[PDB]
């Protein structure tokens, strides 16, 4: 029963790998994240883990830029997220040096997923316990990808991950529309986050980033306050 639960390089008699399921379980117990791909833009939102007045508000961030046109967010464990972010930045710089043009979003997702697939087929290591949401603008067309702890990636129109993500996906299915604007996408993302906050939502405990034809940027707290007041 438990003989096949401890080793990463051991198949179960039914042909299953259990440590990967447990890494996904680690991912599913993290803070919620939301991504919505609208017309002419993409939005990423997340819930902060430093909910106190003692924590400094400009030290560590969960929404990060990789290039001028690529951004990132996660659910799971932060220490793995940092090293993955550093490697992604280096890969993008290498691609620019070799080909003299910015890397496409899909190629970067493929390279990161290739790095993540390793650590699931060797003994003496453990997989990364983190999932990523990747957004980008390329050739006048927005993108939104998700990458798993096992190294598999998907292309989405709207998704949620973290705690209470099944109800979030149901909410998105009910609310998502094809012909949507970026402002309405931001409104819908904040409303989706609000469904499971368990507290009072302010601009000091959520983080929002957007991507459009001008590049990726992270919203300032005053803009988030203005958006929250409009609800």
């Amino acid at each position: 029963e438990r003989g096949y639960s401890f080793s990463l390089t051991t198949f179960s008699p039914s042909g299953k790998l259990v440590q990967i399921e447990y890494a996904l379980a680690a991912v599913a117990g993290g803070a919620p994240s939301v991504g919505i791909k609208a017309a002419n833009g993409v939005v990423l939102a997340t819930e902060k883990k430093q909910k106190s007045i003692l924590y400094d508000e400009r030290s560590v961030h969960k929404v990060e830029p990789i290039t001028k046109h690529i951004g990132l967010v996660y659910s799971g464990m932060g220490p793995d997220y940092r090293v993955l972010v550093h490697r992604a930045r280096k890969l993008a710089q290498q691609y620019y040096l070799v080909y003299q043009e910015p890397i496409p979003t899909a190629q970067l997702v493929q390279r990161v997923a290739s790095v993540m697939q390793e650590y699931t087929q060797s003994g003496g290591v453990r997989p990364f316990g983190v999932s990523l949401l990747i957004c980008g603008w390329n050739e006048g067309r927005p993108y939104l990808f998700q990458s798993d702890p096992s190294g598999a990636y998907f292309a989405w129109k709207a998704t949620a991950m973290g705690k209470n993500y099944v109800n979030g996906k149901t909410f998105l299915e009910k609310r998502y529309n094809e012909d949507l604007e970026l402002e309405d996408a931001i409104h819908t993302a904040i409303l989706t986050l609000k469904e499971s906050f368990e507290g009072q939502m302010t601009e000091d405990n959520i983080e929002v980033g957007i991507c459009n034809e001008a590049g990726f940027r992270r919203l300032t707290p005053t803009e988030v306050k203005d958006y929250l007041a409009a609800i």
């Binding site: 400009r58 830029p65 290039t67 001028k68 550093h86 930045r89 280096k90 710089q93 620019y96 040096l97 590049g215 940027r217």
Partner: protein
Amino acid sequence: SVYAPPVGGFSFDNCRRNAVLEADFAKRGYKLPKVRKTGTTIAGVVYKDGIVLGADTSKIHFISPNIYCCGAGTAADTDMTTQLISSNLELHSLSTGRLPRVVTANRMLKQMLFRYQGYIGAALVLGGVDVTGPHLYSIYPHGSTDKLPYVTMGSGSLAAMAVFEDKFRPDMEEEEAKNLVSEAIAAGIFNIDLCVISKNKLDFLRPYTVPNK
């Protein structure tokens, strides 16, 4: 061995054959392709609020929103060195969240040029502005650097140093600094590209963001 995994970097698989071939062609009297070289005049000064770089005609390379470079020698070498240093500085700024410092670029360029024992062959004039003020350097192909208030390189170097040692004063304004650089460049050649970096056009308190490029 043939079973060893491959590695990256430069390749040295044609040196002996190339030496024999150039010897034979020189003895018999035939020509071979050559590299492209640039030897025009480059100059730069330090004034009260920034740096002014000049060249005669781009030839002024981008390193950072606050750092620029001018090169003389083999064109491919200068291009490759400047691009590599620019990428490294962008990685550094993304990690740190701040605009870089001129001494960091000077250190990286000097170390990388010294690593290759002068075979790269790029002479550079580096200048920029950071939180500690404006700085100006001169880097040589073997890896030696000088910190000076005014530098020049190229073909008409002496005709520019004459003007500099004749009409240079500390703490000048922008306009006459540009004029002095223009005269110094024009003296050597006997149509000029100028780059001006000012501390008042840069914000050192705002968090760093990737430039348009």
